[PDB]
Design a protein around this ligand. Sequence first.
Ligand SMILES: O=C1[C@@H](O)[C@H](O)C[C@](O)(C(=O)O)[C@H]1Cc1ccc2sccc2c1
Ligand SMILES: O=C1[C@@H](O)[C@H](O)C[C@](O)(C(=O)O)[C@H]1Cc1ccc2sccc2c1
Ligand SMILES: O=C1[C@@H](O)[C@H](O)C[C@](O)(C(=O)O)[C@H]1Cc1ccc2sccc2c1
Ligand SMILES: O=C1[C@@H](O)[C@H](O)C[C@](O)(C(=O)O)[C@H]1Cc1ccc2sccc2c1
Ligand SMILES: O=C1[C@@H](O)[C@H](O)C[C@](O)(C(=O)O)[C@H]1Cc1ccc2sccc2c1
Ligand SMILES: O=C1[C@@H](O)[C@H](O)C[C@](O)(C(=O)O)[C@H]1Cc1ccc2sccc2c1
Ligand SMILES: O=C1[C@@H](O)[C@H](O)C[C@](O)(C(=O)O)[C@H]1Cc1ccc2sccc2c1
Ligand SMILES: O=C1[C@@H](O)[C@H](O)C[C@](O)(C(=O)O)[C@H]1Cc1ccc2sccc2c1
Ligand SMILES: O=C1[C@@H](O)[C@H](O)C[C@](O)(C(=O)O)[C@H]1Cc1ccc2sccc2c1
Ligand SMILES: O=C1[C@@H](O)[C@H](O)C[C@](O)(C(=O)O)[C@H]1Cc1ccc2sccc2c1
Ligand SMILES: O=C1[C@@H](O)[C@H](O)C[C@](O)(C(=O)O)[C@H]1Cc1ccc2sccc2c1
Ligand SMILES: O=C1[C@@H](O)[C@H](O)C[C@](O)(C(=O)O)[C@H]1Cc1ccc2sccc2c1
Lengths: 135, 135, 135, 135, 135, 135, 135, 135, 135, 135, 135, 135
Amino acid sequence: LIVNVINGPNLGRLGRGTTHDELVALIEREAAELGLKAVVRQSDSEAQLLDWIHQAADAAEPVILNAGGLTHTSVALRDACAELSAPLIEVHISNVHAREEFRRHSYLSPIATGVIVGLGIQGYLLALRYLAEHV
Amino acid sequence: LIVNVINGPNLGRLGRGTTHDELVALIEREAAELGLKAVVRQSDSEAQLLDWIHQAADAAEPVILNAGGLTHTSVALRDACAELSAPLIEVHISNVHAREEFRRHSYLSPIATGVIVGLGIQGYLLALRYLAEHV
Amino acid sequence: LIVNVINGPNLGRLGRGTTHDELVALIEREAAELGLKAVVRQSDSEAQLLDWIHQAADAAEPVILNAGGLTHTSVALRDACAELSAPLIEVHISNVHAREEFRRHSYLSPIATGVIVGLGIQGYLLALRYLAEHV
Amino acid sequence: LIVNVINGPNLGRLGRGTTHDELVALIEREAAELGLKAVVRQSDSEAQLLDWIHQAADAAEPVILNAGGLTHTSVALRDACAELSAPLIEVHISNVHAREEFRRHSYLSPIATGVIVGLGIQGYLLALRYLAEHV
Amino acid sequence: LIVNVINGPNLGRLGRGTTHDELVALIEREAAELGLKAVVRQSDSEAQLLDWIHQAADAAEPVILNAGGLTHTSVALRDACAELSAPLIEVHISNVHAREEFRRHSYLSPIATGVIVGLGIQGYLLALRYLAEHV
Amino acid sequence: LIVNVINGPNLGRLGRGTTHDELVALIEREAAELGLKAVVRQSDSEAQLLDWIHQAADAAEPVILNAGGLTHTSVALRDACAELSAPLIEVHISNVHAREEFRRHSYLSPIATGVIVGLGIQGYLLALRYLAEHV
Amino acid sequence: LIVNVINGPNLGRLGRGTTHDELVALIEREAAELGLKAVVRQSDSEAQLLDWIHQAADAAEPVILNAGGLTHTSVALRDACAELSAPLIEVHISNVHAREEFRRHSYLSPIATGVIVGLGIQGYLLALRYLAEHV
Amino acid sequence: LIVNVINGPNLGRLGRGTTHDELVALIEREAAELGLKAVVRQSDSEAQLLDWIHQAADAAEPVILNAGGLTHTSVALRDACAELSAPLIEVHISNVHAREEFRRHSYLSPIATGVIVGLGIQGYLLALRYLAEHV
Amino acid sequence: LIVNVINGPNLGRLGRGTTHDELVALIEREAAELGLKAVVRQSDSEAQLLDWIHQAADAAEPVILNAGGLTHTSVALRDACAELSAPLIEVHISNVHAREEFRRHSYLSPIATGVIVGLGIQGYLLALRYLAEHV
Amino acid sequence: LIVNVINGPNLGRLGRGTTHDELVALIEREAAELGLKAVVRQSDSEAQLLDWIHQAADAAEPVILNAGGLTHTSVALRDACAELSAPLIEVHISNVHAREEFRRHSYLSPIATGVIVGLGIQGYLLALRYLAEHV
Amino acid sequence: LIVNVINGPNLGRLGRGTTHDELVALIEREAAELGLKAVVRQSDSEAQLLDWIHQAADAAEPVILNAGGLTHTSVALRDACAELSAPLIEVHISNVHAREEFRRHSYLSPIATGVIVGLGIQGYLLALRYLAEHV
Amino acid sequence: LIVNVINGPNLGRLGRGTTHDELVALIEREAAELGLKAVVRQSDSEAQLLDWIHQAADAAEPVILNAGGLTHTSVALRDACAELSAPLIEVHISNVHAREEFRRHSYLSPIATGVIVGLGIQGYLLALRYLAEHV
Ligand SMILES: O=C1[C@@H](O)[C@H](O)C[C@](O)(C(=O)O)[C@H]1Cc1ccc2sccc2c1
Ligand SMILES: O=C1[C@@H](O)[C@H](O)C[C@](O)(C(=O)O)[C@H]1Cc1ccc2sccc2c1
Ligand SMILES: O=C1[C@@H](O)[C@H](O)C[C@](O)(C(=O)O)[C@H]1Cc1ccc2sccc2c1
Ligand SMILES: O=C1[C@@H](O)[C@H](O)C[C@](O)(C(=O)O)[C@H]1Cc1ccc2sccc2c1
Ligand SMILES: O=C1[C@@H](O)[C@H](O)C[C@](O)(C(=O)O)[C@H]1Cc1ccc2sccc2c1
Ligand SMILES: O=C1[C@@H](O)[C@H](O)C[C@](O)(C(=O)O)[C@H]1Cc1ccc2sccc2c1
Ligand SMILES: O=C1[C@@H](O)[C@H](O)C[C@](O)(C(=O)O)[C@H]1Cc1ccc2sccc2c1
Ligand SMILES: O=C1[C@@H](O)[C@H](O)C[C@](O)(C(=O)O)[C@H]1Cc1ccc2sccc2c1
Ligand SMILES: O=C1[C@@H](O)[C@H](O)C[C@](O)(C(=O)O)[C@H]1Cc1ccc2sccc2c1
Ligand SMILES: O=C1[C@@H](O)[C@H](O)C[C@](O)(C(=O)O)[C@H]1Cc1ccc2sccc2c1
Ligand SMILES: O=C1[C@@H](O)[C@H](O)C[C@](O)(C(=O)O)[C@H]1Cc1ccc2sccc2c1
Ligand SMILES: O=C1[C@@H](O)[C@H](O)C[C@](O)(C(=O)O)[C@H]1Cc1ccc2sccc2c1
């Protein structure tokens, strides 16, 4: 049943129109409809994100990860994610390919099962649906 | 109602386990469930793909495009796609970021609404669901 | 008398304000005024473009070529053009140097007699005038 | 017995001193001497080349491929060739390493069994002899 | 009526077969035929070229510029040219794309209306004709 | 009659299944069948390889060269080879294009008549056959 | 009145001759003389820096930021800073252009109002004076 | 007392809202308030700029330099500036890091004491204040 | 006597066969045998690592550092390490040169006394022995 | 018992304060203490180094290799080393990462078990201790 | 008899121990001893340097050129020098290869007969001696 | 009195019009005229070249070195040359800047006193004259 949705730096600033609280609500509802339980967490702290990924590795739970700016910069986060035995879906709200060049490289994409970008907050819900149809 | 799903070179070879015919069947069924009509087309010919994209531009219809190898190589296809006024969702079955470096660059991604990779054939169905919730 | 004007992919979409049909009309008129006969052809198919270039090589006729996106991508088209014994003038309607970086490289320019960009549809007429004053 | 020899764009222009027709004759004769049957095909159309490669994959037949300019540019052709279970020998008539830098990169060489360049039309005959001694 | 034609370093050396004096004569004649007045100036001094460009910016007059080697090297000249409100047409006599790699980059092309290269001295006359048909 | 076959560093380690001694035997036999005399030499010493190439230049004899790792690294060997007036055929047993990136560059290929890679030890025999049909 | 001065990693080590405490004293005094109130904060924690930047965005207050090593590495910090509606002045004590190449790139400079480097601790005081004369 | 403020090409065009004459006035006033004497000079001529820098080197006077486009292009200007024994402060009015990539490289910054960009004309006044507090 | 051994992100995950607790035990034992006292610390938090490095700089104690993914990414950690007056030995358990290209660059190696990679956990013990023989 | 220590070009010049003879003495003593027999060899000749590596491959003996300048340049040496079935430890006396950029790339490191740099001559002794604890 | 020695920007600053006046004296004396007449000129103005090179081209006289910083930056100077029919010897006083990377590229060296660097002022005298022995 | 002139690979092939023997004769004569004794040596063996450089380092004698292809490739030769306390003059007969790009980089030039290229065999004689006037 359990899927971890992990949001990295600055994702707490959503809607400052959907807020991060609203995003959690939307995800929890969709997960329930799909027969899943979503655990949604957000932090601006890389160490905190690492701890959540370590917990998902120890529990063999899937992860939907939007690492924010750390997507483009953190080898440490990639290394934690490499431990995951269940699926890892990378999600970005914006189309990172339509922006600055530095955003078009991800340390996570090569080790992710798959990647959804540019579909807004619905990307998280689509990632949930992938996991529901593959469990 | 209408969404065009356009598959480029080599996509006719799927399952030679899901075949291209089965993919069409799956897409048509999901579209029907979502209240859409999917028109699925495949060609190994760039000129044929261009014609289908031109038709979607003239009709102001959305496109889900898996251009195959042309993703990485064709400016002509990007230019045709730039004419689309409705959404363009790029889909790849494989995780192109986990493969050769040349596959990590797309001429289409910068002009697409969004991009789904690595989620298998379900990526097309998720793209349909995005379009259904945004119409 | 004879000059071949060859337009590549997407050039049939002009004005969808001058249409491709209007462009042909303008070119034919100017050619007539210059004492030339312009044969204007357009295709989205690389193979078709190659055939037209092969015919111009066999006839030792000049070519004004706007290869569209193939300018930036096709070695095959460059190789066909390398056979031309008469002048080859590359024309682009837009200023390809004021756009994306990938548009600033042409496989054709090194083998062309010369290149006109950014002067709109008048570029074709200026190319005709070059050929008229050099015949 | 059967070996497919596939020639890409511009190879029909040979000798416009050996013509493409003469090349076919030479190949068929050598194949016969080696106890093989050579099926020689040429097209300026990438889609046509893809279809021939798909047929060789379905038949588990070897391919001697001179893709012309598509060697340097086509991921789609590489992807079709990756399906071949029998040997793939890349042949170029000219020494592509003694020419422009862009000719020194091939999308096909990494997936080919081997590569012969610069030995003229005899390269095809040597490729046939490799296949005859390895069958 | 007025068009400024500005030639940069080494252009005074033309024909040392058309000389720079002959070029001025040819341009003035063509301008007269087109109903324009051409003011042709040449200098080996970047500061002098800048002053002429500043004058054209203050007068809102078009410029046909062949900056010679400064095309490839001068940000200062680009910055002066960015002030022009009327059209800027870059002209090179030689096909700069058929020469050394450093000649294939221009600081001016991205801010020019358009660019003519490789058409010899006729390039200036064609630039005049563009300006005459667009005034 | 005489063809020099020169093997560079590590080629003495073949089969430590064909050994270098067996390779010499195979080459000598094929040469005899073709009406040639093959002189096969191997050294791990660049200076020794240079001396053999100098001798072939002084005698105007062809060379089949597999320089081993020096292919990718030695300008001195390229310079010696540039003196050869008779054909130079570069041979590699492995497909150097299917390996590390550094193996895809050769200092020798631009000055070779042609290049055979990935066809195993038969590559040497095919090179002999090229030389026999071109003498 | 309020300006936030935010110092990143290692800036607490100043003078271990001006210490970080002395820097705060100097800044507070200058701000008072200029009719401003400076709030000076330092952390080695990226998450803490992000929180301070988020607070300045919510309050529409200017920021003088010396992000230390994060200048060169953190997309997350750039993204937080992109939310600021008031001016952002980047300050470095050392001349980062006179040091290692990696220090000559900043993720912050493109989104900053301006940048002062190499003027020592006086750079902060000059940034304050800019803000005082622009309020 | 004496500080040289040297402006390079195109800086005479300021306000064609602060004009170069107004800039001189503002600088002279601020210098007077700081107990300095500012000597402000502008030229579009690199040779003239070099002469002014040579004079400042011979007099051991500080320089505030805004070299305009020569910042990005002139080794000669860097070499003249390397002779200065007193401080060299590079100033740019615009934020050169928020513009084209070529503007993000300066030949002067590595040899300058420090660099101020993007603070408008106030940058010169802040540079003066640095020099006043360090004399 | 005192040596600080500092482990960065993900090193707490060792053996999830040697665990991080076992590593501490092994290091403490070897240090004791060498007449040293090892203080072993691990954190996933860059700020925490910085604090430990600052303490070692203030105490003039040597450091054996395995920064994990921060090796490849953190300028802040390099800057903290640059303050160390005693030796800094970089250790990696895996051979970072046999892995992805991004792992072959370290911000720490240029400022380290030396570097041990690929020798497993014994690398830490060898680093201790270096420090014991150099004290 | 047997470990081969192989030193490449210029290592005979050590101390011209530890000489190469002293290095051999130190290594032999440490090996004896560890229950190993060290065979230490040095040559300025790549061919000689290759022969020693071939002997170690045939004997399945470990190698501690300091290839000197050949580390950065020789594919032939890498290829010989790839044959080793026992461990290969690369040692450099100097910290090659603190020097010129060309020294930061090694053809050997990717195929080595591990690498020790910058620990002086003690690096060889530490490599011996690794081999003793892993036999 | 006549050789032109042309010095570019900043060369007038020599000895501010040999001065530029002393350099002229030394050159004139050596030229006289060699049976040549040296005409030595220096300017900080690119236009002036171009004029001197144009005069040498018109007179078919050799040139010894030390272009100072323009060596690395000026295509215009290269283009003027390309007109010279007599020898062009590039001289630099300093060893430009032992300095910043940007100094290791010269626009002039590819078109020069030869190049002398790092031999101090004697380089000019050696260039004279080359010209004397080749006239 | 003593100067070592060391020629690397392929230099024994000179005139196969001046031969290497003639070059030795010319050098010895010029050295005698200058009051020097030239010891001229040539080898195709890097190890032999290293030994000669080691001897010159031990004797504190100057070296004129034309390393042939090793100029562009050998770090080992650079490292031997770095030991020289007397001057090192690099000489190339050809203008290496007018040839292939790989020839425009030298491992030796940064550590040489100076470099002469493109002046033919006279370059060695000019190098001798530099050493004579600086002893
Ligand atoms: O941090 C990010 C950027 O650094 C990434 O390049 C893209 C990114 O992760 C994404 O689009 O999902 C984004 C999160 C992101 C996207 C939109 C908003 S609105 C307020 C915050 C916020 C954060
Ligand atoms: O052509 C492609 C590659 O050139 C792309 O890089 C990726 C790609 O478009 C995708 O994964 O969707 C793929 C289609 C693709 C993927 C799997 C199969 S199995 C038989 C055909 C086929 C085609
Ligand atoms: O295909 C192209 C682009 O791929 C090229 O980079 C530039 C190009 O060839 C040119 O500007 O002439 C252009 C044709 C081009 C330009 C404008 C229009 S409006 C409808 C079609 C169309 C096509
Ligand atoms: O198209 C090609 C070029 O684009 C490739 O770079 C090399 C190439 O495939 C090869 O040499 O075999 C060549 C075919 C080629 C070579 C010689 C001739 S003469 C008339 C046509 C033709 C085609
Ligand atoms: O200076 C130039 C070169 O630096 C540019 O790369 C190209 C260029 O501007 C052009 O071809 O118009 C050329 C002018 C150019 C072209 C031909 C001649 S013959 C005597 C002078 C001269 C100058
Ligand atoms: O040295 C080489 C490599 O350095 C080259 O990149 C490729 C190469 O020359 C080739 O494949 O012919 C190879 C010889 C080579 C190939 C196979 C074997 S098995 C024992 C030795 C050996 C040597
Ligand atoms: O961290 C930094 C470097 O990583 C940056 O490249 C430059 C930098 O931010 C700056 O010069 O302001 C510097 C702060 C910096 C500068 C000097 C000192 S002395 C003790 C600490 C410290 C920190
Ligand atoms: O020449 C320049 C550009 O080439 C530099 O990249 C930036 C630059 O020096 C700066 O911003 O100070 C600028 C001067 C500059 C800035 C604004 C204006 S408005 C009329 C002239 C002018 C000149
Ligand atoms: O984080 C790291 C990678 O990011 C580094 O590139 C290499 C690295 O520091 C090293 O090999 O020591 C590694 C620590 C590393 C190595 C093996 C394991 S098993 C569970 C954790 C873990 C951590
Ligand atoms: O040749 C080398 C350089 O080319 C390598 O880049 C580094 C290197 O192998 C190492 O430091 O071990 C060094 C050997 C080296 C190091 C120090 C000295 S003192 C006299 C000789 C010598 C040789
Ligand atoms: O301008 C130059 C630099 O820009 C070049 O990179 C090298 C250069 O041309 C050379 O060394 O000859 C030098 C002239 C040079 C060399 C030494 C001095 S001392 C006072 C002036 C001056 C000028
Ligand atoms: O080996 C070399 C090339 O590899 C270098 O790039 C340049 C080089 O050292 C030089 O020109 O002095 C040359 C020696 C060189 C130059 C001319 C001839 S004619 C017969 C041999 C030979 C060798």
